[PDB]
């Protein structure tokens, strides 16, 4: 009694999770870009 319990959020734990989520997000975006790049190249097969 006479005290209030705050939150247990570990600020560093969230920040290091953020930077890893950013890098993994960006790497998958590159996978999307190289997927359409391959698709565009494999379109001259029907380009007689």
């Amino acid at each position: 009694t006479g005290a209030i319990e705050g939150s247990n959020v570990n600020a560093v734990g969230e920040m290091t999770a953020l930077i890893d989520l950013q890098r993994q997000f960006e790497m998958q975006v590159k996978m999307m870009s190289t997927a359409e790049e391959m698709d565009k190249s494999s379109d001259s097969l029907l380009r007689m």
Binding site: D39, S42, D43, L45, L46, M48
Partner: protein, 109 residues
């Protein structure tokens, strides 16, 4: 002898089958993005036999679908369409030369 069948050979039935195959291949390409659509294959040997005198084949996917259910491998469809067009062009040349040789003999020109 001296008949159009014995003269043209199987180059008249083959052309029809090659156009049939192109219709099937083009259908798979168009229906690539439709979920639940299963890729359709065509047996050339059976179709040629049926054409000479006169069932559904599905293509096994190389990899699982991403959830939609469509088993159309657009990389393979383009390759087969390119091959079908080349062999169809040869069949037209083969069949076209049958008529030219027949006309050449009946006129001596």
């Amino acid at each position: 002898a001296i008949s159009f069948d014995n003269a043209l050979g199987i180059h008249q039935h083959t052309v029809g089958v090659r156009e049939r195959n192109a219709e099937v291949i083009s259908t798979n390409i168009a229906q690539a993005n439709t979920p639940g659509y299963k890729a359709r294959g065509l047996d050339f040997a059976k179709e040629l036999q049926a054409a000479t005198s006169g069932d559904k084949l599905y293509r096994l996917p190389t990899q699982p679908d991403t959830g939609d259910g469509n088993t159309v491998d657009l990389d393979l469809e383009r390759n087969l369409f390119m091959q079908n067009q080349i062999r169809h062009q040869a069949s037209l040349d083969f069949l076209g030369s049958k008529f030219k040789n027949l006309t050449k003999a009946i006129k001596g020109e």
